[PDB]
Coordinates of C-alpha atoms in Angstrom, one line a residue:
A1 CA 174.5 -15.8 109.8
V2 CA 173.8 -14.5 113.4
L3 CA 170.7 -14.5 115.5
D4 CA 167.5 -12.6 114.8
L5 CA 166.2 -11.1 117.9
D6 CA 165.0 -12.2 121.3
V7 CA 163.2 -15.2 119.8
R8 CA 165.9 -17.2 118.0
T9 CA 165.3 -19.9 115.4
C10 CA 163.8 -18.2 112.4
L11 CA 160.4 -19.1 110.9
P12 CA 159.7 -22.9 110.4
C13 CA 158.9 -24.5 107.0
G14 CA 157.4 -27.6 105.5
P15 CA 154.6 -29.2 107.5
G16 CA 153.7 -27.2 110.6
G17 CA 157.2 -26.3 111.4
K18 CA 159.4 -29.2 110.7
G19 CA 161.5 -27.2 108.4
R20 CA 162.8 -23.6 108.4
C21 CA 164.5 -21.0 106.3
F22 CA 168.2 -21.5 105.4
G23 CA 170.2 -19.5 102.8
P24 CA 168.3 -17.5 100.1
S25 CA 165.1 -18.7 98.4
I26 CA 165.6 -21.9 100.2
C27 CA 163.9 -24.1 102.8
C28 CA 165.0 -27.4 104.1
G29 CA 163.7 -29.6 106.8
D30 CA 166.3 -32.0 108.2
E31 CA 163.5 -34.3 109.4
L32 CA 161.7 -32.9 106.4
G33 CA 163.9 -33.0 103.3
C34 CA 165.4 -30.1 101.3
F35 CA 163.3 -27.7 99.1
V36 CA 164.7 -24.8 97.2
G37 CA 161.9 -22.3 96.4
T38 CA 159.7 -25.4 96.2
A39 CA 156.1 -26.0 97.6
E40 CA 157.5 -27.1 101.0
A41 CA 159.9 -24.2 100.7
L42 CA 157.6 -21.2 100.0
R43 CA 157.6 -20.6 103.8
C44 CA 160.6 -18.5 103.1
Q45 CA 158.4 -16.2 101.1
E46 CA 158.1 -14.4 104.4
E47 CA 161.9 -14.1 104.4
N48 CA 161.6 -11.5 101.6
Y49 CA 158.3 -9.7 102.6
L50 CA 159.6 -7.9 105.7
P51 CA 163.2 -6.6 105.7
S52 CA 164.5 -8.0 109.0
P53 CA 167.2 -10.3 110.5
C54 CA 167.1 -14.1 110.6
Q55 CA 169.1 -17.2 111.6
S56 CA 169.4 -20.8 110.5
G57 CA 170.8 -24.1 111.7
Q58 CA 173.3 -25.6 109.4
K59 CA 175.3 -28.3 111.2
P60 CA 178.6 -28.4 109.1
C61 CA 179.8 -31.3 106.9
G62 CA 182.7 -32.1 104.6
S63 CA 180.2 -32.1 101.7
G64 CA 181.1 -28.6 100.6
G65 CA 178.9 -27.1 103.3
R66 CA 176.8 -27.7 106.3
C67 CA 174.1 -30.2 107.0
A68 CA 170.5 -29.2 106.8
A69 CA 167.5 -31.1 105.3
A70 CA 167.1 -34.9 105.0
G71 CA 170.7 -35.9 105.2
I72 CA 171.3 -32.6 103.5
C73 CA 174.5 -30.6 103.4
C74 CA 173.8 -27.1 101.9
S75 CA 176.1 -24.7 100.2
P76 CA 175.9 -20.9 99.3
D77 CA 174.3 -21.8 96.0
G78 CA 172.0 -24.6 97.1
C79 CA 171.6 -27.8 99.1
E80 CA 172.0 -31.4 98.0
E81 CA 171.1 -34.8 99.5
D82 CA 174.3 -35.5 101.2
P83 CA 175.3 -38.9 102.3
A84 CA 176.8 -36.9 105.1
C85 CA 173.6 -36.7 106.9
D86 CA 170.8 -39.2 105.6
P87 CA 169.7 -39.7 101.9
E88 CA 172.5 -40.4 99.6
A89 CA 173.9 -41.4 103.0
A90 CA 173.6 -44.5 105.0
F91 CA 170.2 -45.9 105.8
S92 CA 169.7 -42.8 107.9

């Protein structure tokens, strides 16, 4: 997706703002693991309370998608701990 407005980088997620919103009912903090509609993901509840634009930060990867949360590489259906970035990955 594209940018939101003047202030880029959508709303954070997780603890304080380590994470952020990604695709749909999802939230995944790179330095804060991946949560789809989970406790640490509810921050995206605001992503469906006010019809407006939004942007994410999904650094691509060969794991059927782009990187995101803890060594995550997300897809259009959901994310997964991808060895591409940190969990199922190397000792990253």
